[PDB]
Write a protein that binds this ligand. Structure first.
Ligand SMILES: COc1ccc(-c2cc3n(c2)C(=O)N(CC[C@](C)(C(=O)NO)S(C)(=O)=O)C3)c(F)c1
Ligand SMILES: [Zn+2]
Length: 299
């Protein structure tokens, strides 16, 4: 029986918001079965809880932001990427401020902190959302699709009109029943361009943004002295973002995601269109993990 997982132990990190550049304390706690993942603004009296679910996404400009009233939890995509990759159904995430800390710009630190604490299998079937039908969303040249597939698999393609890809369109594709999220995707850092410094300045964005937590690019140059973690880092990071944004469904996907330049917006649109077309999906468990179309790392 594929069982639900929580954290074995509590996890504490410190960091800054990429967008707010604020110091934030982060705590992840176990939660009981069918809790799902709930963010908690503990710097407010009363404490303000936003379940990590598609309906709660409010802004998707340069991050996925959870909103309940005038209250946001900004930039959830990387942590939720990590928590999906390791298969966590149930957790309380406590933040002392509006934004998850960026750490190094990838999910590496999160997967490491989580696996150090270890996971706890809980005595209840894990619910899975299976794609039964193709589901597609477009807006101009951006496109995002769910396709039935016995497994979980994430394709992504983007053309940047940017010198730094030395001409080439970035593409990649990963079967997570074949390949490790931890080795191949988790270490892929977020990234930004100096040609956007004005606009970002004019939106009060990327205030915590530096070489220390992001691949920074000035025309022909990635400024990061030590370069990249993979030749295809940028596109592997878009796959990390998609895994996080997708996990706001509140259950794991049996299916294939195909992204063509899709951002946080179009990812979230795809979730909504999907939830809405109940013909296109069903919830399933597996009484025998030995015949499931996906598996997970030992807890
Ligand atoms: C000195 O000049 C600088 C210019 C720019 C930046 C800078 C760094 C970042 N920026 C801006 C930004 O918007 N980020 C988030 C990127 C996205 C939205 C993402 O990963 N979301 O999860 S992405 C890859 O999907 O498009 C990282 C910087 F730090 C310095
Ligand atoms: Zn990202």
């Amino acid at each position: 029986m594929i069982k639900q997982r929580t954290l074995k132990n509590i996890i504490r990190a410190t960091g800054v918001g990429l967008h707010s550049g604020e110091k934030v304390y982060l705590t992840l706690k176990p939660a009981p079965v069918d809790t799902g993942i709930v963010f908690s603004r503990t710097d407010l009296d009363p404490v303000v809880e936003i379940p990590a679910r598609a309906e709660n996404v409010g802004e998707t400009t340069m991050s996925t932001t959870l909103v309940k009233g005038d209250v946001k939890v900004d930039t959830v995509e990387h942590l939720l990427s990590a928590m999906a990759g390791l298969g966590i159904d149930n957790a309380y995430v406590e933040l002392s401020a509006s934004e998850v800390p960026i750490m190094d710009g990838s999910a590496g630190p999160f997967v490491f902190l989580i696996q150090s604490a270890g996971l706890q299998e809980q005595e209840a079937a894990k619910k899975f959302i299976r794609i039964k039908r193709e589901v597609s969303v477009e807006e101009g040249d951006k496109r995002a699709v769910f396709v039935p597939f016995d497994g979980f698999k994430v394709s992504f393609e983007i053309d940047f009109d940017h010198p730094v890809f030395r001409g080439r369109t970035q593409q990649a594709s990963v079967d997570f029943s074949s390949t490790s999220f931890v080795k191949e995707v988790s270490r892929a850092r977020t990234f930004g361009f100096m040609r956007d410094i004005e606009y970002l300045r004019s939106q009060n964005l990327a205030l915590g943004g530096s070489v220390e937590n992001a691949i920074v690019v000035d025309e022909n140059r990635v400024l990061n002295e030590d370069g990249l973690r993979y030749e295809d880092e940028f596109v592997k990071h878009k796959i990390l973002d998609a895994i996080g944004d997708l996990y706001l469904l509140g259950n794991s996907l049996i299916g294939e995601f195909r992204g063509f330049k899709s951002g946080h917006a179009l990812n979230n649109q795809l979730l909504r269109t999907l939830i809405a077309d109940k013909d296109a999906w069903e919830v399933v468990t597996f009484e025998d993990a030995r015949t499931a179309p996906i598996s997970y790392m030992r807890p």
